[PDB]
Amino acid sequence: SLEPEPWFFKNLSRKDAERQLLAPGNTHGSFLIRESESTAGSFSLSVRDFDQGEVVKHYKIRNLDNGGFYISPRITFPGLHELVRHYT
Amino acid sequence: SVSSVPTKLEVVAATPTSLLISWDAPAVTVVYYLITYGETGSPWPGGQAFEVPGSKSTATISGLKPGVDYTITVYAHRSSYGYSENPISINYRT
Protein backbone atom coordinates (compact mmCIF):
# COMPACT_ATOMS: atom_id res chain seq x y z
CA SER A 1 0.00 0.00 0.00
CA LEU A 2 2.89 2.40 0.86
CA GLU A 3 5.48 0.59 -1.33
CA PRO A 4 4.83 2.91 -4.34
CA GLU A 5 5.74 6.08 -2.36
CA PRO A 6 9.40 7.21 -2.61
CA TRP A 7 9.47 8.49 1.02
CA PHE A 8 8.60 5.06 2.44
CA PHE A 9 11.69 2.96 3.15
CA LYS A 10 10.80 -0.69 3.58
CA ASN A 11 12.89 -3.03 5.75
CA LEU A 12 14.86 -0.17 7.28
CA SER A 13 16.01 -0.40 10.90
CA ARG A 14 16.23 2.65 13.17
CA LYS A 15 20.04 2.44 13.07
CA ASP A 16 20.15 2.02 9.28
CA ALA A 17 18.01 5.18 9.03
CA GLU A 18 20.58 7.04 11.17
CA ARG A 19 23.31 5.93 8.75
CA GLN A 20 21.19 6.66 5.65
CA LEU A 21 20.28 10.17 6.87
CA LEU A 22 23.77 11.07 8.18
CA ALA A 23 25.44 9.89 4.96
CA PRO A 24 26.75 12.66 2.67
CA GLY A 25 24.33 14.17 0.15
CA ASN A 26 21.61 14.71 2.76
CA THR A 27 20.84 18.36 3.41
CA HIS A 28 19.42 19.43 6.80
CA GLY A 29 15.81 18.37 7.29
CA SER A 30 16.34 15.32 5.09
CA PHE A 31 13.81 12.69 6.10
CA LEU A 32 12.33 9.28 5.45
CA ILE A 33 9.51 7.08 6.74
CA ARG A 34 10.26 3.60 8.07
CA GLU A 35 8.39 0.69 9.59
CA SER A 36 8.55 1.00 13.35
CA GLU A 37 10.56 -1.65 15.17
CA SER A 38 9.64 0.74 17.97
CA THR A 39 5.87 -0.32 17.78
CA ALA A 40 4.32 -3.19 15.72
CA GLY A 41 2.90 -2.35 12.27
CA SER A 42 3.07 1.43 12.82
CA PHE A 43 5.53 3.81 11.18
CA SER A 44 8.17 6.29 12.31
CA LEU A 45 9.56 9.46 10.73
CA SER A 46 13.35 9.97 10.94
CA VAL A 47 14.78 13.44 10.18
CA ARG A 48 18.16 15.15 9.90
CA ASP A 49 18.48 17.91 12.55
CA PHE A 50 21.38 19.58 14.44
CA ASP A 51 21.77 19.37 18.26
CA GLN A 52 24.10 21.86 20.04
CA GLY A 53 26.52 17.80 16.41
CA GLU A 54 24.24 17.01 13.47
CA VAL A 55 21.80 14.21 14.32
CA VAL A 56 18.83 12.06 13.34
CA LYS A 57 15.63 12.70 15.32
CA HIS A 58 13.04 9.90 15.29
CA TYR A 59 9.33 10.65 15.65
CA LYS A 60 6.66 8.04 16.28
CA ILE A 61 3.60 8.25 14.04
CA ARG A 62 0.75 7.50 16.42
CA ASN A 63 -2.66 6.21 15.33
CA LEU A 64 -6.16 7.39 16.09
CA ASP A 65 -9.17 5.16 16.78
CA ASN A 66 -10.66 6.59 13.56
CA GLY A 67 -7.63 5.26 11.59
CA GLY A 68 -5.90 8.64 11.16
CA PHE A 69 -2.38 9.58 12.28
CA TYR A 70 -0.51 12.24 14.20
CA ILE A 71 2.99 13.08 15.38
CA SER A 72 1.93 16.05 17.47
CA PRO A 73 -1.59 16.12 18.98
CA ARG A 74 -1.99 19.75 17.79
CA ILE A 75 -2.66 18.46 14.23
CA THR A 76 -4.09 15.10 13.05
CA PHE A 77 -4.45 13.65 9.51
CA PRO A 78 -6.56 11.02 7.65
CA GLY A 79 -3.53 9.29 6.11
CA LEU A 80 0.24 9.50 5.98
CA HIS A 81 0.32 11.36 2.65
CA GLU A 82 -1.54 14.23 4.29
CA LEU A 83 0.85 14.13 7.25
CA VAL A 84 3.92 14.06 4.98
CA ARG A 85 2.53 16.82 2.72
CA HIS A 86 1.95 18.96 5.82
CA TYR A 87 5.37 18.42 7.43
CA THR A 88 7.11 19.26 4.13
CA SER B 1 -6.47 34.79 27.51
CA VAL B 2 -6.28 32.72 25.45
CA SER B 3 -8.88 30.21 26.85
CA SER B 4 -8.73 26.50 26.19
CA VAL B 5 -10.70 23.33 25.63
CA PRO B 6 -11.01 21.95 28.19
CA THR B 7 -11.21 25.12 30.32
CA LYS B 8 -9.97 23.67 33.63
CA LEU B 9 -7.77 20.64 34.37
CA GLU B 10 -6.59 19.13 37.69
CA VAL B 11 -5.11 16.00 39.26
CA VAL B 12 -7.85 14.47 41.48
CA ALA B 13 -5.91 11.38 42.66
CA ALA B 14 -2.20 10.59 42.96
CA THR B 15 -0.09 7.59 43.82
CA PRO B 16 3.72 7.79 43.58
CA THR B 17 3.59 5.87 40.28
CA SER B 18 0.34 7.19 38.65
CA LEU B 19 -2.19 10.07 38.35
CA LEU B 20 -5.92 10.53 37.68
CA ILE B 21 -6.55 13.78 35.78
CA SER B 22 -10.00 15.36 35.48
CA TRP B 23 -11.28 18.27 33.41
CA ASP B 24 -14.48 20.27 33.00
CA ALA B 25 -16.77 18.57 30.47
CA PRO B 26 -16.80 21.17 27.66
CA ALA B 27 -19.94 22.80 26.27
CA VAL B 28 -18.97 22.23 22.62
CA THR B 29 -18.81 18.71 21.19
CA VAL B 30 -15.37 17.03 21.16
CA VAL B 31 -14.94 13.88 19.04
CA TYR B 32 -11.78 12.84 20.96
CA TYR B 33 -8.95 14.12 23.13
CA LEU B 34 -5.22 13.47 22.82
CA ILE B 35 -3.20 13.67 26.01
CA THR B 36 0.57 14.00 26.25
CA TYR B 37 2.79 13.58 29.29
CA GLY B 38 6.53 13.67 29.95
CA GLU B 39 9.23 15.12 32.19
CA THR B 40 9.00 18.93 32.33
CA GLY B 41 11.27 20.13 29.50
CA SER B 42 10.91 17.03 27.26
CA PRO B 43 10.88 17.71 23.51
CA TRP B 44 9.28 18.10 21.00
CA PRO B 45 5.73 16.56 21.04
CA GLY B 46 6.05 16.57 24.85
CA GLY B 47 6.42 12.84 25.49
CA GLN B 48 4.04 9.89 25.42
CA ALA B 49 0.56 10.44 24.03
CA PHE B 50 -2.70 8.54 24.04
CA GLU B 51 -6.30 9.04 22.99
CA VAL B 52 -9.50 9.20 25.05
CA PRO B 53 -13.02 9.45 23.58
CA GLY B 54 -14.98 12.72 23.60
CA SER B 55 -17.61 11.47 26.06
CA LYS B 56 -14.98 10.98 28.79
CA SER B 57 -13.85 13.68 31.21
CA THR B 58 -11.08 11.73 33.03
CA ALA B 59 -7.86 9.96 32.14
CA THR B 60 -5.42 7.81 34.10
CA ILE B 61 -1.68 8.12 33.55
CA SER B 62 0.50 5.36 34.96
CA GLY B 63 3.99 3.88 34.97
CA LEU B 64 5.40 7.23 36.14
CA LYS B 65 8.83 7.49 37.78
CA PRO B 66 8.07 8.69 41.33
CA GLY B 67 9.06 12.14 42.64
CA VAL B 68 9.59 13.68 39.17
CA ASP B 69 8.11 16.82 37.61
CA TYR B 70 5.76 16.05 34.71
CA THR B 71 3.97 18.34 32.25
CA ILE B 72 0.55 16.92 31.31
CA THR B 73 -1.24 18.50 28.33
CA VAL B 74 -4.75 17.88 26.91
CA TYR B 75 -5.70 18.56 23.27
CA ALA B 76 -9.35 18.57 22.20
CA HIS B 77 -10.29 17.65 18.62
CA ARG B 78 -13.74 18.81 17.47
CA SER B 79 -13.55 17.08 14.10
CA SER B 80 -12.02 13.76 13.00
CA TYR B 81 -8.89 15.31 11.49
CA GLY B 82 -7.27 18.73 11.60
CA TYR B 83 -6.00 21.20 14.15
CA SER B 84 -6.75 20.70 17.86
CA GLU B 85 -8.39 23.44 19.88
CA ASN B 86 -6.19 25.54 22.17
CA PRO B 87 -4.66 23.00 24.57
CA ILE B 88 -4.48 23.11 28.38
CA SER B 89 -1.45 22.13 30.43
CA ILE B 90 -0.59 21.34 34.05
CA ASN B 91 2.62 20.43 35.83
CA TYR B 92 2.73 17.85 38.61
CA ARG B 93 5.54 16.45 40.75
CA THR B 94 4.70 12.83 41.56
Swiss-Prot record, chain A:
Entire protein: shown range: 121 to 210 of 509
Modified how: Dephosphorylated by PTPRC/CD45.
Chain's role: Non-receptor tyrosine-protein kinase that plays an essential role in the selection and maturation of developing T-cells in the thymus and in the function of mature T-cells. Plays a key role in T-cell antigen receptor (TCR)-linked signal transduction pathways. Constitutively associated with the cytoplasmic portions of the CD4 and CD8 surface receptors.
Tissues expressing the protein: Expressed specifically in lymphoid cells.
Impact after mutating residue 34 to K: No effect on interaction with SQSTM1
Domain SH2: residue ranges: 7-88
Sequence positions bearing Phosphothreonine: 39
Annotated segments matching region Interaction with PTPRH: 34-88
Family as reported in the entry's similarity comment: Belongs to the protein kinase superfamily. Tyr protein kinase family. SRC subfamily.
Phosphoserine found at: 42, 72
Disease: A chromosomal aberration involving LCK is found in leukemias. Translocation t(1;7)(p34;q34) with TCRB. Immunodeficiency 22: A primary immunodeficiency characterized by T-cell dysfunction. Affected individuals present with lymphopenia, recurrent infections, severe diarrhea, and failure to thrive.
Subunit: Binds to the cytoplasmic domain of cell surface receptors, such as AXL, CD2, CD4, CD5, CD8, CD44, CD45 and CD122. Also binds to effector molecules, such as PI4K, VAV1, RASA1, FYB1 and to other protein kinases including CDK1, RAF1, ZAP70 and SYK. Binds to phosphatidylinositol 3'-kinase (PI3K) from T-lymphocytes through its SH3 domain and to the tyrosine phosphorylated form of KHDRBS1/p70 through its SH2 domain. This interaction inhibits its tyrosine-kinase activity. Interacts with SQSTM1. Interacts with phosphorylated LIME1. Interacts with CBLB and PTPRH. Interacts with RUNX3. (Microbial infection) Interacts with herpes simplex virus 1 UL46; this interaction activates LCK.
Domain statement: The SH2 domain mediates interaction with SQSTM1.
Subcellular location: Cell membrane; Cytoplasm, Cytosol
Modified sites of kind Phosphotyrosine: 70
Organism: Homo sapiens (Human)
Designated name of the protein: Tyrosine-protein kinase Lck
